[PDB]
Please model this.
Amino acid sequence: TATVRRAELQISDMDRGYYANHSLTLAQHPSETDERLMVRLLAFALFADDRLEFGRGLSNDDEPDLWRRDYTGDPDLWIDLGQPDESRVRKACNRSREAVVIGYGGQATETWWKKHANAMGRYRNLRVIELDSQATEALGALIQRGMRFDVIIQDGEVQMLADHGSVTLTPMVRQAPAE
Amino acid sequence: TATVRRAELQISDMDRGYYANHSLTLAQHPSETDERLMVRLLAFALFADDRLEFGRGLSNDDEPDLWRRDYTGDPDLWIDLGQPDESRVRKACNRSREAVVIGYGGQATETWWKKHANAMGRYRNLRVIELDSQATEALGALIQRGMRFDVIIQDGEVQMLADHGSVTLTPMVRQAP
Model:
């Protein structure tokens, strides 16, 4: 039994020049924790677009957790949460204009990076970011069936502000595509 | 007219606890020696951040060699290479959260420090480092149009490793916040 959540995001991104409002619906898979759901919501806010959509990346074969696809269907942006294996990383870079991995697993994610850092330099269209695990776990505690967040982004720092609590974190960029 | 230099850096910095890969394009100003191009690439590695940028070149006096700026436009980090005037350092320190002076050149740097130590000590947000001139010269000889370096930093010692060569150095911290 999946459960559907509503999320309203009022986004103020100083870094992007992005100000918009998003009325979202998220189906929480039975295997998806509250923490992972909120990381997906946060991911949407970090990359928010009129055309960004949640994929069903948890019936895990073909889709990312989030994606923006061009007007002919091909992925422009492919976002996978967690610690995808090498083949999943390779696939995403090969399949999409930009691929993003968003890790949040604490020591596991640092160890994963140091293990694969030399390797992942082989990709030029990959963005790897790491979120502090204690912050994501605090963010998961703010989960509700009907949510409203101000997402304030400024100088690489993100605040997720609701009437019932707040979490602020600074995503760590391990790798970004060449501009 | 600028010479386009691409560089990939794979940084493992055990002193900052900073681990990241960076893909950069530098414009080697026609007046910029290969040595100081590589010093500038090294300066990025020493202070690497996703929001660290290269300033415009010798063509523009008034920008630092590298900087990180806030949404406001205030420099969070201000980095000058060589022997800047004390008045320029004073102004940089006043407008930026931290300013950095990276000395390279050899005998140029020591005398600049013999003259300026006192006045610069009253800017408590200033960092001043000196790079050995033998090392920066060796670093410059490793220049190419498409460069890939592993950068390992531990206990103040930096190793820049490429397929075609390696350089090790220990920057000398003359002043720090």
